[PDB]
């Protein structure tokens, strides 16, 4: 049969394939996972659609506020908490920092993570309160320039994987790079994700890069195309198979759609008040 | 509809899918291409198999000598010419260098390309005859230590994409990063290739990373697993559609197998005389 939302059904079949074919391993601390290495899915973004899963609600406020935080170049977790978004709190507090040997680091200074690499790749990091203007490569600005002036390019790439800075990161990048692609006035985006928790993190990442593509599409005067999601270690955690069993038996509703309620002078000119999400209907929460 | 070599048949269907579903575009070199954005295939390396295409012969000597050249960390194209491997020759001679503004550069100094990034990521490049010992990150050594001591890691990654150094590269990286993966003593490798010419370059890259996986597996005392080949712009050139129509109608022979005829102290201890390729049978050349 045809499903109202085929793209999310395929995601459920991804989860289903992992449980059926994946290999059972104990990640390092004992905690087991079910894992397939090498997967790929595509999600249609046309007509403002954004792939926020309907069988299990996604922390939309987190996606939005975190992505703007990435774009701003910030590595200060405290700015995200001032928006009431706690995803980076445990990774930036005293205990977690000291455990990595960052005993001199202010609480919340996550190190040279995503935002720093996107906008200042190759720059000398010191802390999250340093003015890095004009230091390093502005990958996000270069991408936008390539899309506008060289739409046919096959090198429109933005990487967060900086071997020199990995040591000083509280967490190594998970979505390690993405590639953009223009075809018949439509902007597409492929994301390579080295590691993916299909129960929690992966749906969140789909929304982030789906939203990012919609933003870049508007800045470049293009229409949204397709999101290609490539996974390295696509895995489910053993202790959480019950929740996915429930999620899989649910028929997906239609994806919501993004709507930008004002114009923007650049990728840096977005604000939470003008990113609208319409008709996000989900199935009830899962214990 | 079974096949002696299923993995190569799927490749033929990849090319076929590109031709039937791909989008027709004119790239920055003129001359059109047929392209799909986002593809993925898997090739079995178990029991020493290496995916060297049989429907169209691959330049095995180029694969072998170039990969050893990469591993050595060399950026001097002249060493490859001393082995009779003339890829990278036109990219490193006077005309091409001056066209990019490297008017002060010695012939053959390809810049901070693959070899430099693999073994000295983040280091200050100057020329291809400089001792970079202790400079930058030795990603290839980091990967090997991770495989040995942390086989379950989801962060075993080696990237050739350095935004800081792109300007000084004669050619921007095409195979941009790879991720490794250990499961029950089997070593796998996923390659993300931003751009892929299915008629020439892609078959070569599959063998390169296939051989690389076989090599790293032996150093770490593991068995070869799976090669996951992810493509960004997977394309055929409109000029060569006639040739591929023939190639697609060919039944693949069995893949050849790699056999290492002596022990190795490290990934740096390999030589052409001890990498053997057994039973590589190909279909005849195509006009
Ligand atoms: C094992 C593991 N799986 C993950 O998916 C994961 C994700 C992150 C960061 N990340 C990419 C996240 C995205 C969304 C998140 C989250 O906590 N969502 C909750 C709401 C939390 C809140 O309201 O503050 C949820 O939707 O249930 S966490 C960090 C460690 C992880 N660890
Ligand atoms: C349009 C284009 N397609 C490619 O595949 C390509 C590949 C490279 C570099 N590369 C990744 C290569 C892999 C194999 C090669 C090659 O030329 N092989 C010869 C073998 C004959 C010989 O050199 O003796 C061949 O079969 O044409 S070249 C550079 C520019 C390109 N440009
Ligand atoms: O953006 C993210 C960050 C983390 N994770 C999940 C995947 C993992 O299993 C875990 C990260 O652990 P490591 O891969 O770093 O070991 O969190 C995601 O899915 N998306
Ligand atoms: O390792 C390589 C190097 C090059 N190419 C081919 C693919 C292309 O179409 C062309 C690269 O040109 P650009 O990606 O720079 O546009 O060469 C490969 O397939 N593999």
Automatic annotation (TrEMBL), chains A, B:
Any one Gene Ontology molecular-function term assigned to this protein's record: thymidylate synthase activity
Phosphoserine modifications at: 104
Active site residues according to the UniProt entry: 174
Keywords: Methyltransferase, Nucleotide biosynthesis, Transferase
Pathway info: Pyrimidine metabolism; dTTP biosynthesis
SUPFAM superfamilies: Thymidylate synthase/dCMP hydroxymethylase (SSF55831)
Keyword Cell membrane: no
Pfam hit, one: Thymidylat_synt
GO annotation terms (biological process): dTMP biosynthetic process; dTTP biosynthetic process; methylation
Enzyme class: transferase
Residues annotated as signal peptide: none
EC number: 2.1.1.45
Domain Thymidylate synthase/dCMP hydroxymethylase: 10-287
Entry superkingdom: Eukaryota
Listed InterPro entries: Thymidate_synth/dCMP_Mease, Thymidate_synth/dCMP_Mease_dom, Thymidate_synth/dCMP_Mease_sf, Thymidylate_synthase, Thymidylate_synthase_AS
Binding sites annotated in the UniProt record for dUMP: 28, 154-155, 193-195, 197, 205, 235, 237
PANTHER family, per database record: THYMIDYLATE SYNTHASE, THYMIDYLATE SYNTHASE 1
Family, per entry: Belongs to the thymidylate synthase family.
UniProt xrefs under HAMAP family: Thymidy_synth_bact
Protein name, entry field: Thymidylate synthase
């Amino acid at each position: 049969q045809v499903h109202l939302n085929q793209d999310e059904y395929k995601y459920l079949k991804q989860v289903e394939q992992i449980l059926r074919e994946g290999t059972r391993r104990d990640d390092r601390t004992g905690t087991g996972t079910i894992s397939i290495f090498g997967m790929q899915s595509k999600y249609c973004l046309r007509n403002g659609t954004i792939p926020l899963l309907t069988t299990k609600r996604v922390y939309w406020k987190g996606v939005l506020e975190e992505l703007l935080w990435f774009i701003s170049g910030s590595t200060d977790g405290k700015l995200l908490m001032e928006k009431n978004v706690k995803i980076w709190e445990k990774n930036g507090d005293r205990a977690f920092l000291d455990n990595l040997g960052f005993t001199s680091r202010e609480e919340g200074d996550l190190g040279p993570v995503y935002g720093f690499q996107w906008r200042h790749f190759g720059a000398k990091y010191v802390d999250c309160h340093t003015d890095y203007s004009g230091q390093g490569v502005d990958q996000l600005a270069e991408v936008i320039r390539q899309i506008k002036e060289q739409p046919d390019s096959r090198r429109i790439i933005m990487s967060a994987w900086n071997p020199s800075d990995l040591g000083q990161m509280v967490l190594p990048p998970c979505h390690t790079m993405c590639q953009f692609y223009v075809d018949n006035g439509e902007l597409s985006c492929q994301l390579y994700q080295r590691s993916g928790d299909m129960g929690l993190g992966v749906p969140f990442n789909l929304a982030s890069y789906g939203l990012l593509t919609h933003m870049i599409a508007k800045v470049c005067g293009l229409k949204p195309g397709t999101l290609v999601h490539t996974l390295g270690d696509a895995h489910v955690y053993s202790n959480h198979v019950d929740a996915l069993k429930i999620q899989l038996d649910r028929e997906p509703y239609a994806f919501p759609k993004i709507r930008f309620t004002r114009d923007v002078a650049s990728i840096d000119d977005f604000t939470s008040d003008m990113i609208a999400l319409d008709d996000y209907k989900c199935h009830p929460k899962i214990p």
